Amino acid sequence: NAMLYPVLTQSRLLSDLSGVWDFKLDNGKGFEEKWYEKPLKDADTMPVPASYNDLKEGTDFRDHYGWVFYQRNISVPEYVKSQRIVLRCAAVTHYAMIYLNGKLICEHKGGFLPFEVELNDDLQDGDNLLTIAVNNVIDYTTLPVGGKANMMSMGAGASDKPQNNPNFDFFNYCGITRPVKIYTTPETYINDITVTADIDFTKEEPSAVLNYNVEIKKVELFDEEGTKLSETEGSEGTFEISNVRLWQPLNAYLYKIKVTAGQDVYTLPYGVRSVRVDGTKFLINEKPFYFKGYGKHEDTFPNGRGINLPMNTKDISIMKWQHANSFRTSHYPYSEEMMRLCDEEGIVVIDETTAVGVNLQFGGGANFGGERIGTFDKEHGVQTQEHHKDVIRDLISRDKNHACVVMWSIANEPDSAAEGAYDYFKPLYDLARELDPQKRPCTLVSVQGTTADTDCSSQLSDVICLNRYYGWYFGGPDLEVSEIGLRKELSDWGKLGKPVMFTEYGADTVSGLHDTTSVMYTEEYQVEYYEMNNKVFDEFDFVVGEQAWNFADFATSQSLLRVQGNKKGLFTRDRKPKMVAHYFRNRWSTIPEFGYKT
Amino acid sequence: NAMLYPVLTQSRLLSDLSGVWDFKLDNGKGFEEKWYEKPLKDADTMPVPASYNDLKEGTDFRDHYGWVFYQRNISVPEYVKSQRIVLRCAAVTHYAMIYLNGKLICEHKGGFLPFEVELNDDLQDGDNLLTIAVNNVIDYTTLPVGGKANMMSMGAGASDKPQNNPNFDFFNYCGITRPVKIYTTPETYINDITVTADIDFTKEEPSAVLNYNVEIKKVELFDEEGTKLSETEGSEGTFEISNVRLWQPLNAYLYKIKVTAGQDVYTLPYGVRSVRVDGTKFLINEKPFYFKGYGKHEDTFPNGRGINLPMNTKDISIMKWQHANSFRTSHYPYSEEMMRLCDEEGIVVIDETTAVGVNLQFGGGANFGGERIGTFDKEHGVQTQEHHKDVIRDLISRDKNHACVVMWSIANEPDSAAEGAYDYFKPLYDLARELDPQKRPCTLVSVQGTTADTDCSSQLSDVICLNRYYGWYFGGPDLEVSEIGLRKELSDWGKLGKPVMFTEYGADTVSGLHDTTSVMYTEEYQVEYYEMNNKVFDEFDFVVGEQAWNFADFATSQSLLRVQGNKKGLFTRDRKPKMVAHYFRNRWSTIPEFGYKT
Amino acid sequence: NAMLYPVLTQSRLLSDLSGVWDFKLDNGKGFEEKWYEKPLKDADTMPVPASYNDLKEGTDFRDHYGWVFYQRNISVPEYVKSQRIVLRCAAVTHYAMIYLNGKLICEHKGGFLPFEVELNDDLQDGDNLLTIAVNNVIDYTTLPVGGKANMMSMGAGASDKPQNNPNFDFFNYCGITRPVKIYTTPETYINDITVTADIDFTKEEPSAVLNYNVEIKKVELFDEEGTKLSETEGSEGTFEISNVRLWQPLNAYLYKIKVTAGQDVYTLPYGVRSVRVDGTKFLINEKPFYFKGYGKHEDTFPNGRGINLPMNTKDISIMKWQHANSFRTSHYPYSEEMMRLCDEEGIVVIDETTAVGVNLQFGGGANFGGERIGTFDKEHGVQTQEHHKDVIRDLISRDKNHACVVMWSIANEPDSAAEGAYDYFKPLYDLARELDPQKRPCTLVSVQGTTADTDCSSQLSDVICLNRYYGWYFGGPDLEVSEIGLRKELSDWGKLGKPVMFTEYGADTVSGLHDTTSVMYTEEYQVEYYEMNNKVFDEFDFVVGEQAWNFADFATSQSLLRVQGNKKGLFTRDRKPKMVAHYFRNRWSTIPEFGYKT
Ligand SMILES: O=C(O)[C@H]1O[C@@H](O)[C@H](O)[C@@H](O)[C@@H]1O
C-alpha cells in the first residue's frame, strides 16, 4: 500500500541501477523462447530511466506495438544480505513484468506510480540476470484509456497492423519511465509515515500541533538548518511548535522529521500548511488564494516521458520568472523528485490520477449493434473503475505528506454528464476523501459541453475545474462571439456558490508565425485569445484560478490537427518563450498569491 | 465577345491608370447617398491594381462583407476625341459597377476576366470623376461558389454578422485585381484576331500553313528579330512558311504578326505548335509529352490576388531552375501578362475557368427539409451553368492564340459523380470544343472519391486530371497503406485507355519543422510523401503528368486545418524553397520533356 | 593514477548521489564565514549532475564569476564500514574542493576527468554534511585556457566586473558536470586493469593473444552471451582465443573479462581490434579505414555540459541513421558512459585532451611592454604544460582499454607553428606514446594558417588533422576561389606521405533560412560548401577522413559572430536535421568503412 521515497540514510542503502541496459523488441516470440531465461541475443542498447520511443530511428520502432525487453545484470555482496533487499521501480509504463534468473518475481499494472518487490529470496550469489518486460498496449481496461481509432477522428484506419490508438491527446511514451533503484533496510523497518497538522490562527503568533503515525512491519524534529527543537517516543506522537513558519506559496519552509525506530531510521521533510474551501474562496493558510500557472506534461526531448530533473529545475525557474504559483499534473502523477522539489521551491500542485480517456464520445465513438455504446455501458464501456481506485489508493499513499499537494483530481475530461457517470465517480470521491489524512479538496476536470446542471462534478467536487476553449475549437477565429459564449456559461457556473478555476485554455501557436492583423496559429492570435478569456475571468469573483494549456509544446499522436504535436504551449518544447509567455508574465506580476479579488 | 491585349501601337494609345486611388468601405448607405456622384469624403487610400484585403489593419477591414468604392479623376485632351476612347478593366473581383460623373456606364460579373466600355459619349471635358464599386459577395450564383459555412466543417457559425464563406480553399481576395487602362483606336478598328496552324511533319524540314481571320467593326509576318518574310491582303488570309521553328516546351519561339487595316494596326506574337491526344500519349508537336510542374495561385504578399509581374518572372525563373515545364491556372484564369510571358519563356499552361466550388458535398452540405440538397438540385442547388458558359466564352476568346495554352479545364473538383453532373457539363464541354479554333483537349479536375466508372469526366474529357491525397488526407501518416490504395485506384483508371495526370497532390509542410523519424507537417514527411506517390506514378505508362500542389504557400480562410494558410507549397509564400523543392529539382532533372516512358 | 569505471559487482556497492542538492553562489565571503561548516542558509536548489549555468534565470547567474557551493547530506550504515568507502567524482568543472563536516578532504584541478577520495576516516556516524565548492575561473594556467577578452575580438571590454573570457569557442559551462557516486571495495582490492591484444592475421581464421596486468593494492573470460571459454591465475596472464570476432567499426563485439582476486572482483568489457599507421593508409584490423563523422560537443539543453545518456543514445542512433562511423571528443574527454556506449555500438572515437586555447594569437592577442606576447613565452605565455601532462596521464589511464578509442589528440588548434611549439609538445607526445599500452596513433588538430613546412605536427604526429574553413571564414561567399585555395594547401600536405583527415569544416547555418540562389547562413549554402570541400577531398588518396563541424548547434559566449551560439551543426541543438544532414547521409551511404579509395 504505502511507499516512502527511497533516500540514503543511516540504516538503508540506495543503489541506482540507472545506466545503459540491454534492450530488444518482442517479435512476439519473446515469451515462447523464454528470453528472460538467458541474456538477450542481437540486443540493442537503451538508457534507463527513459521512454524508449524517440531513442531510435524508424516508424516501426517509434510506433511499436506490444512488449519490449530490458535486461541488466546485478550483484550484491553478502555482508548486507543480513538486511532486506528491495527493488523500487519508480514507474514502468504501462505494464511491467519483472523476471530474475528466469523466475517471474513481480507484476504491475500502472505506468505512473511506484511499486517494489523483495529480493532476499531469489537473489543467488554471483551475477544475477535481471529482466524487465514492458508492455504498451492500451484499451478499455487501462488508465489512460486506449481507443479503437484516432482521437481526433479523413485520417487513417484502413490498416490491419495492430496499433495503439490513444483516447488521449499525448504520445504513448512507454518503457522504464522513472528510476529503478535498489535499497536496503533491517528486518523490522519503518514502512510508512503519516503527518497531519492541526494549526491555530487565533494568536498573532500562529502555533501548530503535528499528529503523526509511524506504521512498522524516537521521533526527532529539526527545522530548516537542523537546529533540533522537540522529541517524542513511540508510534504514538504529537509535536507542539510555536512561531511556526507557515509553508506558503512561493515562500516555502520545510521542517525536518527524523524517525529513529531501533535498527532503522528515515528522515521526511514536512511543511506546515492549511487548506480548506469556504463557499467562493479557496483558502490556503486561511487566506484567499488564486491559482496562476498551467497544465504541464512530463515531456522533454528525447527522454519522452522519462524523468528529467534538469528540466524540472528549469521549469521551476521559468515559473518563478513568469510569476506563476501552481500547476496540475496533467494527466498522470509526476515523479517523486518533482513533487519533493515543489515542496522545496513552494509551488502549489493539483495532483491528478491517470484517469484520462474515460470518455467514449471522443473519436467517432465505438459502435456495437449499430447503436453507439455510452461511456459507462456495463458490458461494452470502460472497465476501469476497480483499477481506477487502486490508482487513487497508490497516489494518495505516496503524496499524502507533500505540502505542495493542495487538491486531488479524480479524472481529466471524463464523460461526466452521461448515464452512469455519478455511480462511477461517487465511490472514487469517497475513497479519495476517506484515505487522505488531511481531507483536502477533490475535483474532476470537466470536458467542454458540460454545464452546471448536467455535470456530476457539480455535486461530487469541492472545486469546479473547467477545460474551455472559447476562441479556439469553439468560436475561432471570432473572439467576440466566443467572449459572449464564455461569459454565458461562466455566469451559469456561479449558480453553485463553489470555487471555479480554468485548468486548461489555450490556442495552438507555431513559434515564428506572426501578423499585425492576427490569424489563428500566430503568436498575436494566442495573446488576443488569452486577453479575451482573462477579461471574462476577472469579472467573476468566484473564479479562483487560471491555468493555461499548455506550459510547453509536447508530442502527440500524428493527426491532421496536430502540427508536430500539441502547439498550445506558452513555451516551445525546448522551453523557449513565445510572445504569450511575456504577456502572462506581465499579467501575473500584478496579481498576488492571496486576496486577488476577495 | 473578343478582347485583344492592349499595347502601344502606331494607331492606339495606352494610358495606365494604375496608382493610388481614393477608397472607402460601403456602410452600406453608399448607394442611397449616391457616393458615386461626388468625390468621396473621409476616404482612405488604396493602390490599383491590388486586392485590398491585406493593405489595411483590423479583422473588420480584411473580412469586410459587401461593397467598396474606388474613385479617381481622369482627363483627356480633345485632340484625340477624334479617336474612340475605351476603358479596359483587366479584372475586377468579383462584381464591378463603373460610374462616371454619377452615371452608371457599365456592369460586369466575373472577377478574373477582362471587360471594356466605351468612353466617347459620357466623357465631358475637364476633370471627370471615375468611380468603381466592387462587390465581394459569393453564393450559389457566382463562380467561384460561396457556401453557407466554413469549407472544412467545432469551428464558428454562431454569428449573425453577414459573412462570405468560400466553398473553396483560398482567400476571397477582392478589389481591382488587375490593371485599369485607357486605350484609343480609330472608328473602324481591328476588334479580334484569330490564327490557327495546319502544320506538316511529313518532311525532314517541317513546313507550316497559318490560317487567320481578322474581324473588324495588309497582314505582315516578322519572325523573332523582325526580319520580314511574307505578306497578304484582306481579312482573308494564309501564310506558307518552311523551316518553321516549332514553339517547344522550354524552347519557345514567337513569330510576330503585323496587321495593318487602314487607319488601325495591331501586332500579335504567335507560336507555331501542334497538340493532339492519341490514346495514352499526350502529343505536343507529334511527340509524347510529360507534364512537370504544379498548380499555382496568383497569390503574393501583400498584393493578395493582385497582379505581380516581378513575382511572375521570378516564378518562371524558379521553374526553369527546378526543371519544370508546366503549371495549371488554379483556380481561375491568370493575368494576360503572365500568359504572354509563358509564350516568351515557353511554359506549358493548363488554362482553367473560375468553376471551383460547384460541389455542395463540401462542408456539412446545405440542408432544406431535413434532406440534404444535391449539388445539381434544380431548385436549391448551384445556379451557375449560364454564367459558367460566359466564362468559357470570355476565356477562350482571350487566350485562343497563346501557344502556351495546351488544354482547357472546365472546373476544379466539381461533384462530377453525382446526379445531374453529366447534363451540367455536357453543354460546357461542347461549347469548349465549338469555340476553340485549335480544338485543343478539354478536361475537368476530379475530386477525391471519384472513380473511372462514376466520373462524368471519364466520358466528357480527353484527359483525366486527378486530385489525389493518398498519404495526407487519406492514409496519413501510414504511407505504405496509402501506397496500396493509390496503386489500386490508379490501375482502375487505366481502363479508359486515356491519358492520366495528377494535377494536385501534396502535404502541408511548415518550413522549419524537421525530424530524422518523420511525422506529418515536417519537411521530411513531405519528401517521403512525394517519393511514395511518384514511385506509383512511374509504374503506369498511361500517366503523362505530375503536377504538385502547391507551388507556394498561399492564404486561405481561417480554420483549424489551415496553419496560417495552405502550407502544401514546395516553396514558401516568399518563394523560398523547402527541402522537397530540391527533391523535385533532382527528379525532374532526369525526366525529359518528351518521350519519358513512351 | 588509474581509475576503473564504478559498477555494481559481487564485492563492490554503488550508491549514486545524483539528485537535487542545496546550492548557493559565493558572494564571495563563502570561505571567510566557512559555509562548508554548517548547512547552507538561503540556499537555492540544483540538480546533480548538470552544469548550473542555464538552470536559473538572469545574466548574473548565467555569467557568474567565481565559486558556487553544492551541499548534501549523506549517511552510511556501519555494517559495511568493514569495507573501504570511496567517493568518485566523475567530473567537476573546473576546480573542485570537497569538504566534509567542515574538513577539506580533497582538491582537484581538471573539469573533465574523474578523481576519487577515501571516506573511511572522516565519515563519522549519523548524518554527515557533504559540501562541494566549484570554481569556474579560467586563465593562462587552466585547460581549457581563459583569455583577457572575447575570443572573436567593436564588442565589449569596458567593464571592470571580473569575468571569464574563454579563449575557446564554447560556453564555460561549470558545476558538477558528471555523476558523484559512492562505491565500496575490500581492503586489498583490484585497483587497475590493463589488456593488450597481439593478434594474428596470417590465418584464414584469425587468432588473438591477450596479455593483461592486474595491479592490486583468478581471471575469467566470457564472450558476449556469457559462455565461458578460458581461465588463468595470477596478476600474470595471457589468453589464447581462436575464431576471434574482431571488434569492427559499426559491427562491435565485446568479450567479457571477469577478474576475481580474493575478496574483490570486477568485470571489464573488452573488444579485440588492431590499429596501426602505414604511410598513407590508416589501418584498423589491417584494413584501410576512412573516417565518416563529426566533431561533437557534450552540449544539450538545459543540462549544459552535464551528462545526458538519453541524448548520447539518440546521437548514436542518428549517426547510424546517417551512416557515420566516428567522431572526436571536441574539445575535452567525454563521459565514461559515452565511451562504453561507443564500445557496445561500435563507433570509432578520437579521444582528445582539454588542451584548447593554447594559442595566444586568438583575440587581439595579449600585450606587455607594447610588444605582443607569443603563445609559449616563458614568462607571460601559457603556464599549462605540467597540468597538460597530468591530463594526458589521467585520460589514457581511464580509456586505455576502450576498443573504440583509436587515436589520441594532444590539443585542439594550438599555436603549433610558433616559437616554442616543438619544445612544448615533444614531451607531451612522448608521454602519450610511453603510457598508452597499445601504442595507438597520436595527433594534434591544426589551426588554419598552418602549413606542412611550418607545423610542429608535421613531425610529431602520426596523422595530420586539419581544421580548414575554405568557403566560410576564408573565401566565403566565393566557393570557386575557396576551392582553389583548398586544393593548393591540401596538395602541399601530401608532401609528408602521412594520412590526412579534416577534423573540422563547416558553415554557420540557421535552420529555416533558404534561397534558390544561396547566400551565407542558408541551408543551401551549407550544402554547397560541403559539396565543394568534399569534391577536393575525393581527389587525394592520402586523405583518410572527413569529420564535419559540428554535429549539432551548441552554445557559445555572446558575440556578434555567434547567432545564439555556434550554428555550424548538421543538426539543431535539439537534434533535428538541417538539409545538409540528408546530403551527408546520401554521400556517406555510398562510402564504405574500409577500402574507400585504397
Ligand atoms: O486539444 C487540446 O490541445 C487539449 O484539449 C484538452 O481537452 C485535453 O485536456 C488535452 O489533453 C489536449 O491536449
Ligand SMILES: O=C(O)[C@H]1O[C@@H](O)[C@H](O)[C@@H](O)[C@@H]1O
Ligand atoms: O486541401 C488542399 O490543400 C487543396 O485540396 C484540393 O482539393 C483543392 O484543389 C485545393 O484548392 C486545396 O487547397
Ligand SMILES: O=C(O)[C@H]1O[C@@H](O)[C@H](O)[C@@H](O)[C@@H]1O
Ligand atoms: O569557428 C568555429 O565555428 C569553430 O572553429 C574551430 O577552429 C574550433 O575548433 C571550434 O571550437 C569553433 O567552434
